[PDB]
Amino acid sequence: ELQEKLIAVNRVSKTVKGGRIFSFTALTVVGDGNGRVGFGYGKAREVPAAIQKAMEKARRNMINVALNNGTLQHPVKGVHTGSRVFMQPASEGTGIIAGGAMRAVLEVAGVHNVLAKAYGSTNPINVVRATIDGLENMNSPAMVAAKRGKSVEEIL
Template identity: 45%
Template sequence: MASRRKGSRKAEKETDWQERVVQIRRVSKVVKGGKKLSFRAIVVVGNERGQVGVGVGKAADVIGAVKKGVADGKKHLVEIPITKANSIPHPTTGEGGAARVLIRPAAPGTGVIAGGAVRTVLELAGVRNVLAKQLGSSNPLNNARAAIEALASLRTLAEVAEEREISIQQLYSQ
């Protein structure tokens, strides 16, 4: 009976993570006998409580590629601070290849105003009120990576005060 409970707890932890496929693309490699076809899946994994990651998987079938993408996404998780208004602490930008992403906090009730892969990353991170804009490339993988980089660069007031070795009140007075 106790082993069943442990298994159910593990199942609860596994279902805690959500995964969304951003893109599935058929790719080919030229080999001696001709072309070898495989699938590339871009997957975003998040728990909607401040942890999110982007993963890429390649396999001969779609299901295998998605599984590899989920595993890769869980390896590359970033932790982000979320405010009481379910937004981010300050505006930020991120770059991934030729893609640039601008992310700004928004007032409660605004929702997620973003497009494509950036929207998926923000939703799975647990951000509910935010404005985002993709600049440059429209490549979903680069935009997702740029969004992850932007979110990873976020810092709270407490973290900044700790880095500078001053109190939060002194931050406000400067």
């Protein structure tokens, strides 16, 4: 029912004639726990405002994910520029074995049993982007059946 959680809040600076201008960026992630997950990156002069902006962004532009019984559909890799991510379905009771950002994104998405690792850069925004991309691309057996022109029973 739209569970949301803020991964990282980071202070960034701009320089002007006067001096430095600080502002805050908030990376949040929302999801319905049934497949839908979406991340948002808001910027404002103060943290709460930034978070609100991020939340609105995340709530819009969500994406559907094919989940098989609260777990992944197959082992999937994902990249986004520096962040290359691996995530593998695991037996019921394994829990989310996943990094920071990754854990958040998976949890809001609704995966209950995963084995993840973040290779490459572990920059939260890029890592979240990578995970969402991987989750999105991951197809289900009904999808493969549709593509190949067979029944799901012939493929298994």
